[PDB]
């Protein structure tokens, strides 16, 4: 949908996991929708959540993911 766009992740979910946990990562930088930075994720066992790009556990899991 491209009429009214809000953040790809309006909030974040503060649950530290490991790259083996997370099978999809998508990094959304401040858009014309939301002037913030948002990490979208899918954990294979672990659902598809929103992540805090500022949180160090993520920094690893995403870094080591990519």
């Amino acid at each position: 949908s491209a009429k009214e766009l809000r953040c790809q992740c309006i909030k974040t979910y503060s649950k530290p996991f490991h790259p083996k946990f997370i099978k999809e990562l998508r990094v959304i930088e401040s858009g014309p929708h939301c002037a913030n930075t948002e990490i979208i994720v899918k954990l294979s066992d672990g659902r598809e959540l929103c992540l805090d790009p500022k949180e160090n556990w993520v920094q690893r899991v995403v870094e080591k993911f990519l």
């Binding site: 809000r6 953040c7 790809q8 992740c9 309006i10 909030k11 974040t12 979910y13 503060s14 649950k15 530290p16 996991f17 490991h18 790259p19 083996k20 946990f21 979208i40 954990l43 066992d45 672990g46 659902r47 959540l49 929103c50 160090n56 556990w57 690893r60 899991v61 870094e63 080591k64 990519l66």
Partner: peptide, 29 residues
């Protein structure tokens, strides 16, 4: 796989600690 960039040093290993995951909270649309 990746590629591109230049300069660096240090880094690598996966995980972290404290906390955990699954559970609930998160959302968007």
């Amino acid at each position: 796989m990746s590629n591109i960039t230049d300069p660096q040093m240090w880094d690598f290993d996966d995980l972290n600690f404290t906390g955990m995951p699954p559970a609930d909270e998160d959302y968007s649309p």
